[PDB]
Amino acid sequence: ILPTVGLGREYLVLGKLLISLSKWRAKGLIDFDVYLYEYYKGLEDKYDLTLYIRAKDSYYPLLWIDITGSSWTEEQGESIYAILSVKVETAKKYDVLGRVFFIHYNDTEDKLKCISALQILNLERQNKIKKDKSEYYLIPTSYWKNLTELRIALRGFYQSFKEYL
Amino acid sequence: DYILPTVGLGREYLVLGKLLISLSKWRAKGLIDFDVYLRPTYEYYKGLEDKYDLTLYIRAKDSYYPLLWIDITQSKERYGESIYAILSVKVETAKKYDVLGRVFFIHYNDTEDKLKCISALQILNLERQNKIKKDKFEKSEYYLIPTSYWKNLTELRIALRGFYQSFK
Numbered sequence: 001i002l003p004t005v006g007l008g009r010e011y012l013v014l015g016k017l018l019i020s021l022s023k024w025r026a027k028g029l030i031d032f033d034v035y036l037y038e039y040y041k042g043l044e045d046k047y048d049l050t051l052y053i054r055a056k057d058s059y060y061p062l063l064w065i066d067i068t069g070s071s072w073t074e075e076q077g078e079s080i081y082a083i084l085s086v087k088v089e090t091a092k093k094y095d096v097l098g099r100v101f102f103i104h105y106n107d108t109e110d111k112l113k114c115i116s117a118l119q120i121l122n123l124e125r126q127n128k129i130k131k132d133k134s135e136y137y138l139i140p141t142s143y144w145k146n147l148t149e150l151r152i153a154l155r156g157f158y159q160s161f162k163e164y165l
Numbered sequence: 166d167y168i169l170p171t172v173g174l175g176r177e178y179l180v181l182g183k184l185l186i187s188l189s190k191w192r193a194k195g196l197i198d199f200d201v202y203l204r205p206t207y208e209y210y211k212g213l214e215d216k217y218d219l220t221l222y223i224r225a226k227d228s229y230y231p232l233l234w235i236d237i238t239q240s241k242e243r244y245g246e247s248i249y250a251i252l253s254v255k256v257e258t259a260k261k262y263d264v265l266g267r268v269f270f271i272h273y274n275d276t277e278d279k280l281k282c283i284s285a286l287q288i289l290n291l292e293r294q295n296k297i298k299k300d301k302f303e304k305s306e307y308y309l310i311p312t313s314y315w316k317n318l319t320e321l322r323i324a325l326r327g328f329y330q331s332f333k
Contacts, residue, residue, distance in 0.1 A: 003185045003188040003192070003201060005193075007185055008185030009186065011178045011185060012178075012186070015176065015179030015182055016175065018170045018172075018174055020175075022175060025170070033169060036168050036170060
């Protein structure tokens, strides 16, 4: 396990995500604990981080998160991020487009930024981003959004599945 | 089995990330000329393996040798100056195994936007000079160390190179 700038950037994003999640819970923004037949078993090991919730004595994955460390640009204007098309196609297959998030840390703005698999496909339909060859979606940082999006999804899908059971 | 997010754990990964970036930049810029290998939590210092948060190894053929051990660890309005508490046992262990200069404590300074460090050796030296104090809160002793006594990662870099050359 050799150090790289990319791996360090990933742990940086993970750290910032954990802090946010903790602060949301403490401030009362989220009213439930998140944890870091088995539902969505095929999504196991597909994404970097899975956010679970307690059903009873079982755990249910609510959101799946992919950590994006280094950008396509900052390894030598606006920062551009490359996101694997396979990650988005998997979210489509398992009908979880709004629950699959990609996250990066913007240094200049000093803030975590997110985008859903749903929104990536939406930007493709609008011809704002395109797939290109392993295919990658090239997504400028302005199309990414702050973690408020993730927080709203977290609460909404929690309420949906709390009702589903 | 399932862990709950905490601000403390988030800060640890943040420090770990910053450390990995720094180590990588030193290697890329030629500030270190050898490969370092991390591991979170005859083989030398096997008793120290579970004692600290991170261990930096170097590749000795197919074996790994630990060069340094690293521990990851508002305050101004409360105490007048920013102070960090380090468990006394962590320093006692460094003394016991005679690795005082190879055991480092690290925190992320948010205002300065930099990682700060101090060695177990430096802590004991400050204690002898009566510059810092040990103290019990409630047992488990703690060294109370103001941020000004901490130093930038250049200290750690010099140690890394020096001890690499020593054991090579």
